Amino acid sequence: QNDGAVEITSTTFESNTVAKGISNNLRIDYVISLPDIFKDIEPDFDVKDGVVTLTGYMIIRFVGNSNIRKGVSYPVSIDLNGKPSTVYITGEEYSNSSSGAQYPLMYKTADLPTAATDKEQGREYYGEIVDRNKPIKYFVEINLGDGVNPNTRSYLSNADFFDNIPKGMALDVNSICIKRMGYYDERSSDVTKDFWESNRIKADTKHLEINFGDIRYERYTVIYETRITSTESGYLNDAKLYYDDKELPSKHYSKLSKD
Fold first, then answer.
1. Rounded Cα–Cα distance for residues 241 and 152 (Å)
2. With respect to CATH, is domain 106-256 assigned 3.40.190.10?
3. To which protein family does this belong (predicted)?
4. What per-residue string of b and e applies to 138-174 under the rule 16 or more CB within 10 Å gives b?
5. Of 56, 70, 131, 192, which alpha carbon lies 20 to 30 A from 169's?
């Protein structure tokens, strides 16, 4: 396949199988019709109902759809100055819920270095706050799964996050920042303005409450900042996700250094 300037040498997939929620890509070493089993298509550029107009190469990233069938091949055509050239990817299906719910549904971490403190049986880790006047940035990753396969995520009905901020700390309510990643989505997307505007965030200096509703295999991150108001021995931040008649805590202890 050669038009003149451009000689398409090869056309190869990352995996020659494709499945529901799984990252893949076409790679075209030198208009391209993708079928209805390819959601979330993205590398001039174009995406037009699964049709993509444009010694190097070109990677078109896609993700498999709900309507894939195990064993069935599906065409991707590659039309350059007429002369159309078709290759095939075979559908696959994994029983996703048959993987027993092992991945934690919430972590609460911080933008601090770690020190240890030896205890009667174990070391407690903690965030060392070196500078009392600079703020402490907490992150909270709700429904991560493994962090690459979105089928490792859950369905959480009536999800309602709730953090009591530690005594001697004060939440900057303006610092609150909710990122969202849908099942099919590629990157996080700042949905903070959407959540304030739809009456989901109730937050004073001592409290946080986000009402996510039905988390539908959706990874939410929650970044907020805090400031030291009063000296304490430590600062045990207590996050709590309430989902479908359950409660789940995450905890981040942090202490000031010797100064």
1. 18
2. no
3. Belongs to the serine-aspartate repeat-containing protein (SDr) family.
4. bbbbbbbbeeebbbbbbebeebbbbbebbebbbbebe
5. 192
